[PDB]
Amino acid sequence: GHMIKYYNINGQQVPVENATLHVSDLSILRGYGIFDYFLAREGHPLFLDDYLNRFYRSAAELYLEIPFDKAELRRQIYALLQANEVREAGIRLVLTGGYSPDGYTPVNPNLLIMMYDLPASAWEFSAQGIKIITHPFQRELPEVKTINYSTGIRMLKTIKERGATDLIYVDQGEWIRESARSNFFLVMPDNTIVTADEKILWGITRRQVIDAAREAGYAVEERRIHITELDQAREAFFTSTIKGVMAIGQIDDRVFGDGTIGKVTQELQDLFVGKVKAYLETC
Amino acid sequence: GHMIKYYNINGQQVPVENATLHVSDLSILRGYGIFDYFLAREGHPLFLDDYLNRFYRSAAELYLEIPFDKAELRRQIYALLQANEVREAGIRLVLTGGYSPDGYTPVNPNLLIMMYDLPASAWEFSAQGIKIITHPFQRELPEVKTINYSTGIRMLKTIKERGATDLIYVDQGEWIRESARSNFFLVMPDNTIVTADEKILWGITRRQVIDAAREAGYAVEERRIHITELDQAREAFFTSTIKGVMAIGQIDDRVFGDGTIGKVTQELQDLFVGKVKAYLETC
Numbered sequence: 001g002h003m004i005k006y007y008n009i010n011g012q013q014v015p016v017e018n019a020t021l022h023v024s025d026l027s028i029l030r031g032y033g034i035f036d037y038f039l040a041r042e043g044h045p046l047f048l049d050d051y052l053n054r055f056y057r058s059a060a061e062l063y064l065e066i067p068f069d070k071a072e073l074r075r076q077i078y079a080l081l082q083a084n085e086v087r088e089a090g091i092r093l094v095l096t097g098g099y100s101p102d103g104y105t106p107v108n109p110n111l112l113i114m115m116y117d118l119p120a121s122a123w124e125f126s127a128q129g130i131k132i133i134t135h136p137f138q139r140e141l142p143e144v145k146t147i148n149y150s151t152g153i154r155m156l157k158t159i160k161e162r163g164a165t166d167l168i169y170v171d172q173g174e175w176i177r178e179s180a181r182s183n184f185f186l187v188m189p190d191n192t193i194v195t196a197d198e199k200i201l202w203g204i205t206r207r208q209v210i211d212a213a214r215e216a217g218y219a220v221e222e223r224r225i226h227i228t229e230l231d232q233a234r235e236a237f238f239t240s241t242i243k244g245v246m247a248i249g250q251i252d253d254r255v256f257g258d259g260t261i262g263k264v265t266q267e268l269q270d271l272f273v274g275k276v277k278a279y280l281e282t283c
Numbered sequence: 284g285h286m287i288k289y290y291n292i293n294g295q296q297v298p299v300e301n302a303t304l305h306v307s308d309l310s311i312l313r314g315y316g317i318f319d320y321f322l323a324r325e326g327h328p329l330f331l332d333d334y335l336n337r338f339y340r341s342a343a344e345l346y347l348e349i350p351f352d353k354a355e356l357r358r359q360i361y362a363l364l365q366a367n368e369v370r371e372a373g374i375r376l377v378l379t380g381g382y383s384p385d386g387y388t389p390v391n392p393n394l395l396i397m398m399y400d401l402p403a404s405a406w407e408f409s410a411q412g413i414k415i416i417t418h419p420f421q422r423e424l425p426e427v428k429t430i431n432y433s434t435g436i437r438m439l440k441t442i443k444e445r446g447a448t449d450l451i452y453v454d455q456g457e458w459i460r461e462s463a464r465s466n467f468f469l470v471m472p473d474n475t476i477v478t479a480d481e482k483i484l485w486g487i488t489r490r491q492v493i494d495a496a497r498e499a500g501y502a503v504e505e506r507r508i509h510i511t512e513l514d515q516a517r518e519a520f521f522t523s524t525i526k527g528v529m530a531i532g533q534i535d536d537r538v539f540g541d542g543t544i545g546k547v548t549q550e551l552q553d554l555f556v557g558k559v560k561a562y563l564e565t566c
């Protein structure tokens with residue numbers, strides 16, 4: 001495991017210790033930007049075309065022009081894995097509103113490519129379900145992967161104080177959406193998989209799990225989820241790039257099962273790992 | 284007018300060209316931070332204690348500890364005006380979530396003090412009212428001056444395309460709040476001044492104008508404002524640090540008067556200038 005030595009800023013490889021932005025950048029002053037994050041295994045960013053299509057769609061929703069095409073960004077990503085001499089990594093793309101003249105009006109974005117060790121916790125797939133709280137909130141521009149995590153970060157103290165390790169956002173306290181950094185699923189007692197269809201981020205992991213579940217012949221409903229449906233479900237889980245599929249054992253005082261991982265959630269962990277293995281066989 | 288040469292980062296004076304943050308800062312990655320902005324005239328930041336009390340209240344709502352007390356921050360601000368050899372300036376404080384280990388969990392904040400020329404447009408007080416559009420939106424954590432301006436910035440294209448130069452947020456399209464960077468007032472045909480009391484930023488300029496209006500013996504109602512009240516008002520105006528009091532001539536196709544500045548709005552421009560003159564007489 002070679003230590004990460006380099007990032008890329010605006011197409012230039014830079015040592016990690018010299019990777020800076022001038023304080024006029026609109027990410028610092030105005031929180032204006034998008035990002036993406038994905039893993040690399042065996043030298044290959046996972047589901048890369050899907051992440052990069054999302055990154056370009058996000059940038060278009062903020063009217064931020066990425067300074068070159070998808071194939072050139074992919075070349076820069078691969079060049080950075082080779083420069084760092086790593087096969088196993090986390091990769092962050094950031095696209096800011098740039099060095100604005102007036103601290104508000106965007107200009108040519110700043111583009112950052114950052115690289116990390118593969119998170120040690122990635123796809124841990126604990127048999128013990130996590131404990132989470134509901135929080136009334138709706139993410140702004142939820143289909144765009146903006147850099148805006150204020151509410152999620154501000155809630156870290158309250159989450160920890162209340163005895164939880166994460167949250168789930170409930171729009172108007174009525175409609176189940178997503179966590180600050182994960183998509184959210186239920187499994188009903190008849191094995192129907194349920195997840196929100198609107199006003200959420202369209203996770204790559206969510207997409208792979210829904211596809212894998214539908215190919216295994218599960219019923220998957222993408223629909224509005226009322227809060228009262230937490231009392232009808234057998235299982236609950238999170239999806240994300242780093243979690244894969246993560247069992248939820250308790251939401252408020254609703255305990256799912258004995259709190260350990262449900263049968264469908266564990267099957268979907270194996271199916272997700274199958275999607276990853278299949279992708280790496282195309283690389 | 285001496286050119287601004289220095290900013291202050293974490294209590295160190297730094298040349299403008301060297302004022303940077305490492306890309307691990309949570310403002311860049313997660314949009315986590317607060318700020319404040321105020322003018323200086325005759326060598327004196329305006330209403331300074333009120334801005335600094337707001338800055339400390341904002342920081343406490345994000346659980347970000349400013350690394351010293353209000354009197355030490357004030358000393359640093361004054362030291363920077365002297366270092367730049369300016370009497371007339373705009374001043375920006377930023378407090379970020381800092382260089383987070385995991386790209387999410389805040390740590391010791393990064394504190395920035397930036398300085399600018401006095402905006403040339405500041406307190407222009409145009410007799411011609413500006414043209415603005417309504418936009419359905421509610422700011423997150425609206426009483427905190429967070430760095431999150433995504434929606435306001437994203438809307439710049441649409442504002443310009445629709446023939447306007449600003450917007451007004453309408454919560455659920457029912458309740459009048461504020462613009463992205465200004466508080467919003469109405470004046471009714473009986474001269475009652477109306478402004479929202481909830482789910483807005485508590486502007487310093489708003490506070491000075493309400494106080495000045497109440498001292499002049501106007502009726503000032505701080506209350507919920509229904510969208511249909513735009514058709515009942517004689518005048519509309521914006522308040523902010525840079526606008527002072529700014530006449531609004533049109534909101535959608537509602538034209539206020541002949542579109543030129545209303546009688547009460549102009550009186551409040553003079554009263555606001557009186558509050559500034561009175562403050563500078565205490566310095």
Ligand SMILES: Cc1ncc(COP(=O)(O)O)c(C/N=C2/CONC2=O)c1O
Pocket residue numbers: 036037178179180181182183201202203204205206239240241242
């Ligand atoms: C708001 C939100 N929803 C859902 C997801 C999951 O999308 P996926 O990773 O499956 O595409 C994330 C990404 N979560 C993280 C975790 O920290 N870095 C990220 O990018 C997210 O930030």
Ligand SMILES: Cc1ncc(COP(=O)(O)O)c(C/N=C2/CONC2=O)c1O
Pocket residue numbers: 319320461462463464465466484485486487488489522523524525
């Ligand atoms: C959301 C919002 N509401 C109201 C105001 C007005 O508050 P005041 O300046 O009267 O305290 C601002 C500040 N507006 C700007 C304009 O750009 N820089 C700022 O700080 C603001 O950002």
